[PDB]
Amino acid sequence: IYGVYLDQKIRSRIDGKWQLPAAVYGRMVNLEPDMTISKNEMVKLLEATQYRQVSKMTRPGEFTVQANSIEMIRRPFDFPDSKEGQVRARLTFDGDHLATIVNMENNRQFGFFRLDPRLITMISSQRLFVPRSGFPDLLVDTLLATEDRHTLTQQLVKNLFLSRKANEAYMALIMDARYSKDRILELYMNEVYLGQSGDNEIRGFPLASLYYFGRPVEELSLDQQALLVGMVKGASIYNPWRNPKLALERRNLVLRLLQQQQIIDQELYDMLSARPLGVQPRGGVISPQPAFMQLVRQELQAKLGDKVKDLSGVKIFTTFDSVAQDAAEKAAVEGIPALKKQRKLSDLETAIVVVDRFSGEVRAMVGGSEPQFAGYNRAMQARRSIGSLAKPATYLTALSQPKIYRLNTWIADAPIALRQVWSPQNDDRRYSESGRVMLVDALTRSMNVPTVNLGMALGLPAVTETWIKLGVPKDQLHPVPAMLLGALNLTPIEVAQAFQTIASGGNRAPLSALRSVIAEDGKVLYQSFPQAERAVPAQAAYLTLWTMQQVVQRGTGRQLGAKYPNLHLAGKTGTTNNNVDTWFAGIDGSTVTITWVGRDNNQPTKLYGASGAMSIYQRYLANQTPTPLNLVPPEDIADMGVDYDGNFVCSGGMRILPVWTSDPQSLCQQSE
């Protein structure tokens, strides 16, 4: 009964079938002649779209770099607009911009050169069962040149059934005749043990192609197939990131082993033997971008519905920006250890969210001080208290009443006591000796007593109505005199949507991460359109966004205006009582960034809002090239000058402040 027993056990493991996976792409870049991008700014964009920089390109996906230009072979892609193939373009640069996109094939010109998006990850529900015809032709021939399976039957049983010399040996004898030799290797190449990551087993050539190179197995270069085949006798000995000198002498060994049965000449060998390890030089992950992909799967469940379970072969198009995500992670993993050691802190975390200024598309996300971990997303689940970051919504309600509240209205700065008895004290405990401060020196310096004296005069039923227009949920707003100073609990994904209505000029655009979902045959299952609803007046969201340029240049965030004085950042620094949380919401010409820095156990941190999330931010700016903030004044905004006593004057004045007025002759009445 031995023969009958083993046969039934074989079919048990062999069965379990397959389907295709769904691919998740990033955003699409469109290169254009005379566009603001440098050569070193262009190599960091291609290297983030998974473009191997080689010294002699021969296969789609490789780009070389030259004197003052960049040659490249754009890999084929099926764009939602049209279907395109290879393109050999030579991007000639002109210093700080892009001159020409001459097509190398016939020295033609290009109107605008489209770039294929990057593959974030593949999702199946890993199934990843590429059939016997989905593997390259030089892959089986490279596995046979180093594993003659004209030998392959025993190797299958060792990986499949084992992690018993009698069982597996008898297993191989009955598997050889019962199954065809083309059904054998199809099960082998999809089950080989090729590496170990943490506690998860990297099995198969499909799943090991994405793990090591981040690209489908049908696109492996012949020097990358030799590395992946040379690591069948590897498994945490011959793998890179540990011994990237031993995987290399095994890579070259398989090449000269597979050039014996001639399929590579000496010119091709010296070419391939010189290319370094093509592995993604960051550390492969089984499930990459876990913080962002939580926002996508949530967006897929809501926007599609019950069809989210039948995603087979569909291409998913997101708004993920890869250059901004590399700079967001590079600042969290390298900034948090620099804050912990200086204050002798035991733990410390972070979260960073980047959205587009005018459209609300999410470009980056970081869930913690180790963004490549999984299990807790602090940018979507950590509900912290915003603190001093809730003043821009008090002054945005004052400034939306231009008949009575301007940038020079005098606010009282006297000791106050209310009934929640409550008596706020300034964040530095100092009081103005004149007894009053203007409405611009109150937000620039982030004063606590004037903000209450201004917030109590408007009434909380009005400061609450502003918070709802900005896009916070009605259930988080509990109206008490402490809300004015930031007794508000919001996740970094709700603070980024609040400061996006101020940054765009009042146009509330709902944050999104799905661009479009195209089925496998060409049918469009979902196509996103902008909403961009109007919330606050464009003249009140400019006077607030102007004052937020003073809180960066000479205000509480002046330490940024001394480092990037050309960008003209706008940003509010957030502090709390005893520094439980510290934020920094900063705005530049293109994106809104929200940073949080605090301890998960809710204890004090010793970090001040100008040294916590603000120091993580001035790293995020250094890891890329930001766009300057240029505020264009809307209609009816007219600059007027004030004298010493804070009155409008006809000409001169010791200070110039914008004023929302349709008849700038208000100074004629206030001069007299």
Author numbering: 82 to 98, 100 to 207, 212 to 236, 267 to 279, 286 to 542, 547 to 798
From the paper:
The last two steps in this pathway occur through the activity of penicillin-binding proteins (PBPs).
Here, we determine the near-atomic resolution structure of the 83 kDa class A PBP from E. coli, PBP1b, using cryogenic electron microscopy (cryoEM) and a membrane mimetic. In comparison to MoeA-liganded structures of PBP1b, we propose that the observed ~40° relative rotation is likely ligand-induced.
